């Protein structure tokens, strides 16, 4: 097989944020998401609670989609109502393909990413959040409480939402579905990375990714000597990355990929050689912190609307 690269999923291939449209599908509750997301930051960046990882935003919002009787069949509908690539996302992969594999690394439920990874050809490997849906047996006293929950969390900011929040996710029935998942969070995506770098002897790691949830992925490549690039990132992934790319385009991300993955440490000399319509080019140790954060987000809202400026994964 061809060398692998290390690539997030939503934001670089695909626009959908998939927690926040199963929520909306389930709950049609933004201010519950935004709520669970901010306090998923919160806990991850802010205060680094010890065990917890940036991305698990929606390992805490499966005992509700459980309570509230999502099956697995519910997630592929979704997944397939709601996909929205990011343009030139199957050009892009296909020229991609040609010589390296993607290997994909999502906070998001796997099921997801094994049917939109489909939608636009993706061949390689794929690793995210794992549920089984239909095995999670909630009793109907603590569906009731979880579903009453929702617009009292809703409701609620600041400390007095997180204070709530830690106490929910310690009762010991909450507690016992949100173990039942094996979430992908920013730590597991350093760990993975790591694993492949190991077993597929990788000197040279090429990462991509674009918020909190990839930042310790982008940290793990940089001391393995590698390469940590954002495409339209956001604060979190911009203080973490080597590289930013902003642009309206995947084919930007097909360029710089493979010309890291052919020159290796010798791409960078290149970069401002790289000239396709919108798209802008940083190195990050070269150029001004807020001018690239200013236009990233910029064009991070222009793909992905406002769910471009939401936390948690
Ligand atoms: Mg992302």
């Known amino acids: 097989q061809g060398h692998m690269f290390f690539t997030d999923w939503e934001?670089?291939?695909?626009?959908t944020d998939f927690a926040l449209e199963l929520c909306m599908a389930v709950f049609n509750n933004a201010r519950f998401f935004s709520n669970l997301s901010e306090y998923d930051d919160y806990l991850a960046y802010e205060v680094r609670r010890e065990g917890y990882e940036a991305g698990y935003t929606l390992k805490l919002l499966t005992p509700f989609l459980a309570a509230a009787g999502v099956k697995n069949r519910d997630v592929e509908r979704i997944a397939e109502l709601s996909a929205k690539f990011v343009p030139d996302a199957?050009?892009?992969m296909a020229t991609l393909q040609e010589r390296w594999t993607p290997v994909v690394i999502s906070t998001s439920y796997t099921?997801?990413?094994?049917?939109?990874?489909?939608?636009?050809?993706?061949?390689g490997e794929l690793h995210g959040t794992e549920v089984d849906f239909d095995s999670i047996?909630?009793?109907e006293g603590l569906r009731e409480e979880l579903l009453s929950?929702?617009?009292?969390?809703?409701?609620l900011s600041g400390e007095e939402l997180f204070?709530?929040?830690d106490e929910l996710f310690s009762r010991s029935e909450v507690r016992k579905?949100?173990?039942?998942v094996k979430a992908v969070g920013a730590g597991e995506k350093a760990k993975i990375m790591r694993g492949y770098c190991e077993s597929k002897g990788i000197d040279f790691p090429v990462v991509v990714g674009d918020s909190i949830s990839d930042y310790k992925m982008f940290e793990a490549a940089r001391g393995l000597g590698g390469v940590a690039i954002a495409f339209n990132g956001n604060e979190y992934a911009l203080k973490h990355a080597d590289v930013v790319i902003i642009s309206p385009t995947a084919m930007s991300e097909a360029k710089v990929i493979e010309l890291f993955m052919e020159r290796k440490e010798r791409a960078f000399e290149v970069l401002s050689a790289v000239s396709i319509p919108e798209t802008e080019i940083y190195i990050m140790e070269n150029s001004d912190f807020g001018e690239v954060l200013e236009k990233s987000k910029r064009m991070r809202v222009r793909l992905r609307g406002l769910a471009g400026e939401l936390g948690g994964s």
């Not at 934001?11 to 626009?15: H, N, R, V």
């Not at 099921?111 to 061949?123: E, F, K, N």
């Open 111 to 123: 099921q997801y990413l094994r049917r939109t990874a489909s939608m636009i050809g993706v061949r």
């Open 137 to 139: 047996a909630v009793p």
């Open 177 to 180: 579905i949100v173990e039942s």
């Open 149 to 155: 929950i929702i617009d009292v969390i809703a409701s």
């Open 11 to 15: 934001g670089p291939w695909i626009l």
């Open 163 to 165: 204070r709530k929040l």
């Open 90 to 92: 199957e050009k892009a």
